[PDB]
Structure 1
């Protein structure tokens, strides 16, 4: 009887794999388009963030002059 409940629990109750693959098509339509953006982010980020951190580095170095007058 539990098996019957297990029958209820079986994934893809809609039993429409042909539609499921289409769902996966929509998933590509989402994910794959997301990928270029999400990858573009780091390029839009760290590429400048390094240099800006270096700009912090300059002031950090010049602090030492005051530290040792």
Structure 2
């Protein structure tokens, strides 16, 4: 009985992989372009981070010296 009910649980699927394969290709292209966007915005990010880091460093040494 368990095997029977599991056979009913079984959803019918096309043995042909064309639909799946096409889905696959869409996802790969999609993650590719999203990865490019991430890369551009990530280089700009790290540049920004360097800038703010310099301003930080000025602050820290200046503050320490002046108050102490």
Give the corresponding residue for 2:37: 37
| RMSD over aligned Cα atoms | 2.5
Counterparts in 2 of 1:51 and 1:67: CA distance versus 1, 3 Å: same
The number of residue pairs the alignment matches comes to 68
User: Which stretch of structure 1 is more off in the superposition, 18-27 or 48-57?
Assistant: 48-57
Report the CA distance shift for 1:23/1:59 in structure 2 as closer, same or farther (over 3 A): same
SS of residue matched to 1:50: helix
Give the whole-Å Cα distance in 1 for the aligned partners of 2:62 and 2:34.
43
Q: Which moved more, 1:11-20 or 1:25-34?
A: 11-20
**Distance change >3 Å, CA 22–CA 7, structure 1 → 2:** farther
- Distance, in Å, in 2 between the alignment partners of 1:41 and 1:12 is 44
Give the deviation of 1:51 after TM superposition. Answer: 2.3
Moved over 3 A (4+): 4-16
Stretches of structure 2 lacking an aligned partner (at least 5 in a row): none
How far apart are residue 14 of structure 1 and its match?
4.9
